[PDB]
Symmetry: D2
Subunit: 251 residues, 4 copies
């Protein structure tokens, strides 16, 4: 019976067509947020809109690329058309190449930084302005455990996720006076359909052993924390990094 | 319309007769937790129980001193009698002497460590064992911003609050396999009745300036995060430190 | 009488022609490292080489832009020609524009990320491989206090400095077996001659008040910590972030 | 050829009769500090003084218990008799019972807190006052990796080491104006004689795999960082926590 104070407003969820973003969109919509599901994949975004509406909520899809700053502007316009924009979850991200720093391709490095960091900044610019103009709101940036610790052969990803904590702190300091809160969420390894499909039984067991709870997280377990932080109940929470990692970083 | 998945279980709230503890007790009870309100002050604990019952919730008072290990045992037994113990909020605490490290009195130092650290540990022993035996639960330790930064003339307090992050990490690692989660909450300065009553209009303005949001927090703004973290929605959150500080530690 | 175990090897210092980089180059060279001073400013780079040689040390200048990956490769080749490359200090950096996240120039953002983050990665690729090939070494990345806290109107800078902590962690994990250590240094505000010329009296006084020591740091006070971490004395120090901040982040 | 700017002053090293404390005493004395080696074990302290004097240095032994506040006062007086007290290394510590938080001995908990936390505070009171009177100095508190992460079945130890980071921050803030710096060092697992004696080959191999460098640290590798932080070269380093952990906390 979990319910969040996220009604009478619109919410952008970037990369909302799949995995954690999908879970976030469904949880926000279930508590009455009018959710704009943005994604590269138009049909995936539309499927989540349809699921939302089969469960009785409000949502719309917008297909595009968050690395285009024009798209973040179009997303803020499309969200505001549904209801006043007071939530943005900058969740779209990619894993990058699996290689050492020394071997890493320049193209892969630049692509991971562009999506996982620069596109969050691009999206935030219109999000911050819209929320400041309409009395306040919450931006939740999807970081990772890998925003605070490393993981061999994923340096670009780790670097970008670290970067998000600083961007989060700065926007929080700058827009607090406008009652725009900005926070970062740090999930541990989450069992998405893609992760499940990629991991060998042995590789899965290895990752499970790195979490004190002895399992990977579920997308719904991240979505709950995101929905709480985006809600009016979290009105004194800003600038901060919130782990949902099953104890990964506690050792 | 915030509701938390904390029903069909008992919750201990230490120091539940005043301030943050009172707000925590009211929030947990309003979502269906059977709350044991524990406090040195019997009449204050009884007053909170009366408020909970008038609002349609279930609670009971138990008066005593958390620095007596026997009292933490008695609290766990009394809570279990209401419903299976699956939440404990170790919130009781004192501000301590205002003095430099060099001037700090030994008894004053020892008293702050005894209440703000050792009593949390004393309570956790029977809490952890009870929750492990009945299939899992959540312990929320009330730390502070001063668990991660300092504040001149409050060294014993700062020291105790830093200590809680380690006790929290360790219990989380040790009882994760039993599905007992242990987390720490770090509020900024909160406008409890005693904070209000202490601060001159000038000293209040000074502290407000140290929070990006330009105000002190409200007890209910801490209680919301505590209730979320103590609930089934927080099932992948353990070992971690969660700031509710209006941006205090982001600069 | 401070002396560092940095002899019989070469050291790259990027941005070594002025400010903190100059102080690092002078300190390393005075303890026997053969220092390759790299800088956009060829006159400054040659001037620091002349200072080093006047004090009886060994150095050479290479003028160029760290944002060109080919220049980092050329820097490693030129350093290896002096003596085996076992130290690299990725110090070159820019402040970026002063603006809110919402107003921030896209080009200024991208330029700050490019110099302060991507160029460190570009340089690290050949540095890591050279040091792994010759039995180990130390890479010191120049971060900031602003790698762990924010500062209003310098979001791009804060973001890039945060990113460096992750890049540092990851390279440390990946090259530990090759005995290549990678660390980050986090200075507070440092009164370089350039800063002393730029800051108004009022701006300087404001910043001094944010440091417990009540002053800005000296470039030599950063250089000493860099020289220590780059030395054989620091053989068990890797992956970590080391503040030299006069107490800035302790509150 | 490493040398530290620690001459023309006295240095207290608590627990200096063995392991890391012994290495710290030897390294400080070799760079000209007059070292007061304090320890429960008078003969062990005397043996370290004998080694120091054989190597050409100045030292004296003082046997006592750091949990007696009168002993820390006596230690400051004895150090000042050699030369002006400007270094204190609060290194004395014990391990504690190996048990879960739920099973933990109240006696063991209180003993670990008393030595590893309260005695550091007890010694710091006269240390801070003496150094303030002498024109400044440095206090290095021996924390651990376990001041920032947990380790199952060592909760009291982990809790005490976390506490030290707060005590360090607060003393740094309060005595910065007197030029007394206060820092914490966080070693990974170190091959002291008692670690090598107590760990099975299998337990040692397990811990080696938790450090990126694939080995435990040596006492001399902690002593170099302590000596640096205690020296005039570290004059802008205060309030901060410095890991010497072979990458342990970077993942
Ligand atoms: N183990 C995990 O899954 C895990 C753990 C911690 C953090 N995260 C973070 O959570 C977020 C979501 O991860 P996920 O596992 O659900 O991934 P996913 O691949 O299942 O979903 C990501 C979605 O983002 C979209 N997307 C990617 N690039 C885009 C772009 N340029 N423009 C618009 N949409 C774009 C994709 O189309 C996809 O639908 C990411 O930021 C990821 O880094 C994931
Ligand atoms: N600004 C703030 O108020 C603030 C900020 C951060 C953290 N905290 C933490 O919040 C917690 C609650 O503080 P508060 O501000 O609500 O204070 P408060 O004084 O309003 O309430 C504290 C309660 O704890 C009880 N208590 C004290 N010692 C006890 C003992 N030995 N045994 C049993 N009960 C005892 C008191 O009787 C009182 O009812 C404390 O741990 C405090 O450190 C407070
Ligand atoms: N307050 C401070 O000064 C302070 C505090 C903390 C961190 N830092 C960091 O220390 C480092 C040095 O700062 P500083 O104050 O000495 O700066 P500075 O501007 O005085 O010197 C920087 C040097 O780097 C060179 N440089 C800049 N971009 C370059 C490029 N693309 N290629 C090659 N050389 C380039 C410049 O020519 C110059 O000689 C930077 O990373 C900065 O972020 C500075
Ligand atoms: N793996 C490690 O060895 C390791 C790692 C991180 C931190 N540390 C810390 O390093 C410090 C030194 O530990 P060590 O490994 O060298 O231990 P050790 O047992 O070799 O030496 C500790 C010394 O402290 C003395 N001592 C203990 N209690 C005392 C008291 N009450 N009064 C006076 N002297 C007392 C002992 O007599 C002994 O000589 C401790 O704080 C420990 O927690 C050790
Ligand atoms: Zn009474
Ligand atoms: Zn009363
Ligand atoms: Zn000057
Ligand atoms: Zn701060
Ligand atoms: Zn004896
Ligand atoms: Zn003996
Ligand atoms: Zn050995
Ligand atoms: Zn870890």
């Amino acid at each position: 019976m979990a319910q969040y104070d996220v009604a009478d407003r619109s919410a952008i969820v970037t990369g909302g067509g799949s995995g954690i973003g999908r879970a976030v969109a469904l949880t926000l919509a279930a508590s009455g947020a009018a959710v704009l599901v943005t994604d590269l994949n138009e049909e995936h975004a539309q499927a989540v809109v349809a699921e939302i509406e089969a469960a009785g909520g409000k949502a719309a899809a917008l297909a595009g690329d968050v690395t285009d700053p024009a798209f973040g502007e179009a997303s803020v316009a499309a969200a505001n058309a549904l209801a006043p924009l007071k939530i943005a979850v900058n969740n779209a991200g990619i894993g990058g190449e699996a290689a050492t720093v020394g071997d890493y391709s320049l193209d892969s490095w630049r692509k991971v930084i562009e999506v996982n960091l620069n596109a969050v900044f691009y999206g935030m610019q219109p999000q911050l302005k819209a929320m400041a103009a309409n009395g306040g709101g919450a931006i939740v940036n999807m970081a990772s455990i890998l925003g605070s610790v490393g993981f061999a052969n994923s340096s670009a990803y780790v670097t970008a996720k670290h970067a998000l904590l600083g961007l989060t702190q700065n926007a929080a300091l700058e827009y607090a006076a406008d009652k725009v809160r900005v926070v970062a969420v740090g999930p541990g390894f989450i069992r998405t359909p893609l992760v499940e499909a990629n991991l060998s039984a042995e590789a899965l067991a290895f990752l499970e052993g790195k979490h004190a709870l002895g399992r990977l997280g579920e997308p719904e377990e991240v979505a709950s924390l995101v929905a709480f932080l985006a809600s009016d109940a979290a009105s004194f929470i800003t600038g901060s990094y919130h782990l949902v990692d099953g104890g990964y970083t506690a050792q």
